[model samples]
Target: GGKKKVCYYYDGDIGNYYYGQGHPMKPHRIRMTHNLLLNYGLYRKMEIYRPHKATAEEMTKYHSDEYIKFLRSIRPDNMSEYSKQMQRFNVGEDCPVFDGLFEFCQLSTGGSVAGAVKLNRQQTDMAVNWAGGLHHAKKSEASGFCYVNDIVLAILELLKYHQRVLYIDIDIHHGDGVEEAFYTTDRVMTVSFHKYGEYFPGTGDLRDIGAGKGKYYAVNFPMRDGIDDESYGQIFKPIISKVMEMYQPSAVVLQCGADSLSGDRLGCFNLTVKGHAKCVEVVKTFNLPLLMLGGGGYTIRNVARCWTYETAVALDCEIPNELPYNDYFEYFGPDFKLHISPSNMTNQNTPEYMEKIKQRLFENLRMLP
Candidate 1:
């Protein structure tokens, strides 16, 4: 069966920005993703477009003017001139100021905004913006390597055409920024599956659903280390299916963060490429206007493999498990496989424990309108 047309947004300039040495967040991974897409000829299968740089005016839809200005002007050499903003916006070691910080933000955020417009105008049934999904970014602050909250801005655009938007995040880290942005609104239901407790940025709690009109609109599944493929589907499929049925959202935004894959430098899950993409496959079956965005993925090779494979899934194309020899073939290592073997990591999500989580989540969903 054929699927709807898909549009892919990317900018080569995004790969030039450096997060400094030894930082887990690398913009070069964007290049890796693009390279694999080309190697696999995935780019030819979809309509690829270069995103126009977003102006400060466009960024202000979600980010603050003061923050945007700071991002534009701040430099390591002029650190003394904007110490207050640097501290205010949490721009430090974690979120560093390298060569093209503002340019990178513009390009990345622009890709997301463009993707949203494509979906809104019915230009494409699904749009992939691998540069977007910097979800940890706050309204006026940068956190966990995300400067601009592109997901928030994109959702705001989607709201113009769709009354209710369902936001699903599979990032190993929580989608805290997006969740907090729509925390008081019932129009957007945010669900995050993350490694919770004592982790970086550490805020997704199962009990923290929502407040006021948004009560029960936010849902979090705080998972443990070493969750496998089957374990992930067992929870993700049923819960997302239920959310789709109950919420009946006009559009769906999925943050397909690849860091949840096994052997991720910063992640704890054991999911493989197929396992992670399976979530995308399930979401597409719903036949809703879908916008897919990239999120935190540290292992560069895996990030490339995961997003490329998922792109194939979005286009309803079946790719062989063996990866094609490409410019970056050496990066794939010994097996040179597109599919990653399951991690030896033990599955920490017990059946009984999972039942408790499911029960608790459904209880919260029942409280929603």
Candidate 2:
């Protein structure tokens, strides 16, 4: 494959914000990822662009106007003012209202909405917005760490240029909000490989396919714990091939969430950084306009490693396994290697179970046309 025109979207100030004292979702990791990108000299390979502060109207394309208003107005000190609304909006513990919360969402969401614009204009083949991919944000409510649905807004933007768009989520958590957003439409298909069962916001089941015009468009590969590289590839490649063959989407959006990787603070999968990035490489082979985005990755250090390596993959650049020296280098300490090995978690996703789901999903894909 030839090299691509990669547009990297990042905001310098995105890291300074804090989710709270004990919150696991950290923005500081973005800065760490950025530093790694720089130390690796990856910044030289692409045209780095800053997104315009996404107006509330832009975010409202997918998010509710009132919810957008709530995100814009709420703050850490004014909890009493938003007591009932907090419960109403699902913004208590996980999705907290912190300092510069609105601007934070603006920066994250803006990168994606603008990335969509770049791809539509043919300015870049692949747009890397490490800040975007907040897939759990709903039209009127917040779930997980996402307060605004950046993926939805970006896909909406892409839909304007292309008749059909494909969304693939490699995040460990179910992409419930995004699946629900396009639940009734045919123009966009949502595919998510997430760990099901008693997980948080548990909604993605094999039977919960799309409705009406969107039937069989929403694909969920409900994975079990400790599914490693080979197991992940066994399902990922074949299913993704079926999608590319069936859907023929003109544009694709992928959520490269590092939480699915081993040793994540809240993940159960046994995917390595290489395994996680295999999704990126495979998608890149499709040669369609792509928006590669970041989603739920709680383990900050590994999050940095995964995204950095994935960025290199997008650039078609083979980087050194030994990471370049940087301030956050200590975080990747001991070996300080780029690709860390996955933990020896027992492979809970047996071939029998995987075969069943693979055939089930192929059946669902066959029903598309």
Candidate 3:
């Protein structure tokens, strides 16, 4: 019989949840995606588990001792004052305090921890932590909505058995936090493709290649807006195929951030959901042990569709040919109906500009600064 391919999911991870009351990162994203999965019967074929709190040691694998302590000190139970956590941890404006703040952070990490464990055992052909992939959290401070950098922890665990791991991030924004954690490590190579030229949290530049022994390990393709599926296919297929052949990674971890789509409230690129899915498909062709994750996605409706579509593709199931429901229409309003289509497959085209990008990618991996 073929290896059992199990899809893993959890509810306790819903704890790291957020609700800003009109803020882009809403709490309903998890619920909406989960509901969509069930509504489509994808849940029935998958194995589900509740995330367990990660131990301090498990988290310390990626975070600093002092930083973890700082997060704990800010918990409501340990509350001395609002300023106690806010001013010190840089939690203000970016990440704020909510009830059970520490526990929720723990829950989120726990879900990712669970993903790492399942992947390690080979119980599942592949695994996904949709609740995980908050790639912006640093070892000492939380920058983006992420409090703990789960992707770092998952790959670190994988390294115990497999030395070469490739991390591919396709978010509209840079995967800065994860890159910082492994900046000097030669064994892990991180490749990020995101919008550049003053995008939010601005970090990933092509010249920011890995340093020290990891000099060539980091590869970045800074994109400008209006890159359609054609450009995406050219850059992704050639580069990823070359990387896999050259690096021969023992495993692959991909962060599929949905904000790359054209209509995202915070996204600048003109990619449709189809464009994002192709990246996922390219990674699958490698057939290495794969751990897929959900990263940053604003505009909850698009987030839901992007992730759900990815899940369907990962499970070896046929991609649904049409939009399943118009529920996302409510959140996006009438404008969505015209721009967004529920079609699972996207058109393929590679423009002339992409040849320049392809050349740059080869040069970057070879004589990277």
TM-score ranking, best first:
2, 1, 3
The reply for model 1, stretches above 4 Å from the true place, is none
- Highest lDDT scorer: 2
Tens digit per residue, CA lDDT, model 3, 1-369: 233375575673473456455557665676677766666678767787777877777888878887787777675444556565566667756687666566767766777767767877877767877777889988778877778888899888888878888999998889898788778887889989888787777898878888887887888887777666667877898999877877788888899988887667787666767778888888887677788888888877788777877887777665454444644436644553313542333322236556776687787666533
Q: Decide which is better by TM-score, 2 or 3.
A: 2
The lDDT for every candidate, in the order shown, is: 0.90, 0.92, 0.75
User: In candidate 2, what residue range of length 10 has the lowest lDDT sum?
Assistant: 200-209
Total backbone clashes of model 1?
Answer: 0
Off by more than 4 A, model 3:
1-4, 12-16, 76-85, 319-353, 367-369
Clash counts per candidate, in order, are 0, 0, 2
Positional deviation of residue 241's Cα in model 2 after best superposition, in angstroms = 0.4
lDDT of 1 at 325: 79
Candidate 2 colliding pairs, count: 0
TM-score of 1: 0.98
Q: Could you tell me how far off, in angstroms, the CA of residue 267 lies in candidate 1 after the best superposition?
A: 0.8
